[PDB]
């Protein structure tokens, strides 16, 4: 299937409490592999997946040097934005940035991204053509003009279409056992009386990877988006994910309901029914 | 633009020196390079943003800091047997984009201050043969025996510095190619029409501004301390 | 990333056209050309960004290859002022510029009325003590080094007298020796057969 590499950066000012807190994390698909925290003692980009620890000292020295430069740039950016928006120096503000690339099943470049948000709202983004900018307002227009004058997009495009994709391929290979695998959901159903005439059927999907999954309840015919509670997919904490869907049904009609599970790790969709 | 004061720097071996680089271009990225005679540029250290810096290709023996956006000081420590060189600072609006260069600073580090000598300057008068053969008169200025090779030679005609008919050697000559602290020589020519040289009222002066010791340098030798100074030689026109 | 400049050195006569090359196996997002004079800061001549773009600044023409892996600098009717070190540089992936090693360009003057001669000039302040001046030879002539370590000889330089619309090459030689005379001053160099030697 397709794959992605994404880097997420967050810088938060804290006036009167020192320099802004900077956190960087990197992911390949739904797996985190690196982190940097400006408040930590190590002051190094650190591994968060076993397969990246195989990279040599030059790799780590390089990621650490580069991430420290990102930290200082976004620290300056907080100051610049406070100015562009004529804000006081007393409040805390947030700059977020994300960039990365997607590749298709053939591991060839599919799409690139590079965008920013200020206080949780879109600020500026490189458009899909990787040549033009989408600016949210006058402040962002100032940034856009600055970046056009210094030809930032052309250099970013080269990274997103080349370097980025090359790193993604490298990581997909070195971490092949963990990244190119699929963990099919382990499933089960529970039943609980919620009254003297109704019951709750809950369909579980546990320990699956990647996170993408579809859980649906059907009654004799199809889909039941009525009185069906579906929780947001959540991390189990061990690299896998979980999700459940529940339906409230008239007591005695359990037989009419089936839970359908779709996941890339399953050769064929699962159909589950309540079996006391 | 970019300022690198001073143009010439002289230090005794073992004495750390910090080269200044200041820019008023509102640029985020700054760079330091060194250049040896007849060679290209070698990157020492750079900084893409205030409060961050990273090594170039030849950072050993050097150190920098970037506490302010406008400045990028380069400290030359006990690097090695090669701190003497031409140092250039540059800046770019954002890193990786077009760089604008400062004027450069020539740093010479010597083993012993007693190796410092001011230039002796002499002006050689045009020969009668050249005058009768070409109707032109060439004056030659020779600055000799100086070290370091930090000099600025200029010609003055009747009190005005001239930039006409002048040709000064691009590079000096080592009076001792063997010694690393060899003294240097430099020549220059000023050519005028025979008619101009034949007016006894015309005064010619070759001026050599030398950059040497400062007041911070101690001096115990018997000869005059070789401090920064101007040494000149002159000639006057001659009627035929 | 690498940038290769060719040729390393180029010597041409004033008025000729010339081309210098900057080549790489990798793609650059932006590229610059600089001209530097000895002991001075390099001067930025141009920045190119678009593949295939051409920029003409006076007598200089710059081109950026369609693939953005190469660039060239072409000069029309070279003037002595064009002499210098030409450097190309490209955007570096690690936040710097990747520099080529440069092309050293020397533009020689066209001496229309060569009158090679070796003159003896005397110190204005001292009896005896003098220098030998080899002057007015065409640019085809080259001044060689000295045999004795005690004999000093400068490289040839060009001098312009705009007043008289005149240009001339010259080199100087002097020695602390006694047997040294302007007659054998430049004996280690190929000097014009008809070089005037004042008697």
């Amino acid at each position: 299937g397709s794959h992605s590499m994404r880097y997420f950066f967050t810088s938060v000012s804290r006036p009167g409490r020192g320099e802004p807190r900077f956190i960087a994390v990197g992911y390949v698909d739904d797996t985190q592999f690196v982190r940097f925290d400006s408040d930590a003692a190590s002051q190094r980009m650190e591994p968060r997946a076993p397969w990246i620890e195989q990279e040599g000292p030059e790799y780590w020295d390089g990621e650490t040097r580069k991430v420290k430069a990102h930290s200082q740039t976004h620290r300056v950016d907080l100051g610049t934005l406070r100015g562009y928006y004529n804000q006081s120096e007393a409040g805390s503000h947030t700059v977020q940035r994300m960039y990365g690339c997607d590749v298709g099943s053939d591991w060839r470049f599919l799409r690139g991204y590079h965008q920013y948000a200020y206080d949780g709202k879109d600020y500026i983004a490189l458009k899909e053509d990787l040549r033009s900018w989408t600016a949210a307002d006058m402040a962002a227009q100032t940034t856009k003009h600055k970046w056009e004058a210094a030809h930032v997009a052309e250099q970013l495009r080269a990274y997103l279409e080349g370097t980025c994709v090359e790193w993604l391929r490298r990581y997909l290979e070195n971490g092949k056992e963990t990244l190119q695998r699929t963990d099919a959901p382990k499933t089960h159903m529970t039943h609980h009386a919620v009254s003297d005439h109704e019951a709750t059927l809950r369909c579980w999907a546990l320990s699956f990877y990647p996170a993408e999954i579809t859980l649906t309840w059907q009654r004799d015919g199809e889909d039941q988006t009525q009185d069906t509670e579906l929780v947001e997919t959540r991390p189990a904490g061990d690299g896998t994910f979980q999700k459940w869907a529940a339906v409230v049904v008239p007591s005695g009609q359990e037989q009419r309901y089936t839970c359908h599970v779709q996941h890339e790790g399953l050769p064929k969709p699962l159909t589950l029914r309540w079996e006391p | 633009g970019i300022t690198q004061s001073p143009k010439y720097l002289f230090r005794k071996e073992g004495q750390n020196v910090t080269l200044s680089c200041e820019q008023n271009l509102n640029h985020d990225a700054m760079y330091w390079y060194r250049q040896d005679p007849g060679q290209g540029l070698r990157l020492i250290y750079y900084s893409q943003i205030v409060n961050d810096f990273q090594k170039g290709d030849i950072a050993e023996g050097y150190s920098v800091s970037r506490e302010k956006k406008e400045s990028f000081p380069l400290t030359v420590t006990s690097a090695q047997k090669n701190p003497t060189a031409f140092y250039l600072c540059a800046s770019s609006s954002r890193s990786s984009y077009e760089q604008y260069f400062g004027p450069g600073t020539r740093l010479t580090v010597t083993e012993d201050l007693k190796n410092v000598f001011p230039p002796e300057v002499a002006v050689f008068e045009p020969s009668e043969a050249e005058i009768s053969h070409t109707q032109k008169a060439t004056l030659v200025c020779l600055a000799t025996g100086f070290y370091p090779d930090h000099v600025e030679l200029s010609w003055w005609v009747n009190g005005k510095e001239v930039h006409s008919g002048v040709s000064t050697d691009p590079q000096p000559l080592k009076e001792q190619p063997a010694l690393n602290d060899s003294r240097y020589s430099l020549s220059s020519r000023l050519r005028v029409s025979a008619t101009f040289w034949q007016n006894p009222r015309n005064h010619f002066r070759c001026q050599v501004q030398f950059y040497g010791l400062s007041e911070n340098d101690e001096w115990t030798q018997d000869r005059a301390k070789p401090v920064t100074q101007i040494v000149s030689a002159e000639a006057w026109g001659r009627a035929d | 990333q690498l940038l290769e400049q060719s040729p390393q050195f180029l010597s041409i006569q004033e008025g000729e056209n010339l081309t210098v090359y900057c080549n790489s196996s990798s793609v650059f997002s932006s590229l610059q050309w600089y001209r530097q004079e000895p002991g001075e800061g390099p001067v930025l001549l141009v920045t190119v960004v678009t593949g295939g773009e051409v920029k003409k600044l006076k007598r200089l023409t710059f081109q950026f290859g369609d693939a953005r892996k190469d660039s060239s600098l072409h000069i029309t009717a070279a003037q002595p002022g064009d002499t210098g070190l030409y450097l190309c540089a490209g955007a570096g992936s690690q936040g710097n510029l990747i520099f080529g090693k440069g092309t050293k360009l020397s533009v020689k003057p066209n001496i229309q009325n060569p009158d090679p001669a070796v003159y003896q000039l005397r110190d204005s302040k001292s009896s005896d003590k003098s220098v030998c001046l080899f002057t007015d030879f065409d640019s085809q002539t080259n001044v060689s080094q000295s045999k004795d370590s005690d004999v000093y000889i400068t490289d040839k330089t060009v001098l312009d007298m705009r007043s008289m619309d005149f240009k001339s090459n010259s080199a100087v030689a002097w020695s602390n020796k006694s047997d040294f005379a302007c007659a054998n001053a430049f004996n280690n160099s190929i000097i014009p057969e008809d070089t005037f030697f004042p008697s």
Binding site: Y7, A24, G26, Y59, G62, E63, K66, V67, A69, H70, Q72, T73, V76, D77, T80, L81, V95, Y99, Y116, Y123, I124, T143, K146, W147, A150, V152, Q155, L156, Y159, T163, W167 | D28, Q48, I49, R94, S95, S96 | G92, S93, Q94, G95
Partner: peptide, 9 residues
Amino acid sequence: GILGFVFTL
């Protein structure tokens, strides 16, 4: 691997 060049907004 992250970007090797940084630039201010």
